């Protein structure tokens, strides 16, 4: 099918997010990411990874 599958507008396939916060301890680790989603798309969380 041609129409109603892929948007013609410019749209990233893969996004890279920078950690907005990162606090380290002597044995552990911590990272906070501002996961953003475009206003006209859906994200399947299974593909997200570190």
């Amino acid at each position: 099918p041609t129409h109603d599958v892929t948007t013609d507008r410019s749209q990233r396939l893969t996004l890279r997010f920078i950690p907005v916060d990162r606090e380290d301890t002597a044995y552990s680790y911590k990272a906070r990411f501002t996961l953003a989603v475009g206003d006209n798309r859906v994200l399947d969380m299974a593909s997200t990874y570190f």
Binding site: P1, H3, D4, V5
Partner: protein
């Protein structure tokens, strides 16, 4: 209906209504074939 489907014919290619799914380790499965 849907026009968003691969069409292998003039007729659309659509799977079974009943397709949404589950399995718990349990053995809550150990269930049979697609056939």
């Amino acid at each position: 209906f849907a026009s968003l489907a691969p069409r292998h014919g003039s007729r659309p290619f659509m799977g079974n209504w009943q397709d949404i799914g589950t399995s718990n380790m349990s053995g809550g499965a150990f269930s049979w074939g697609s056939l």
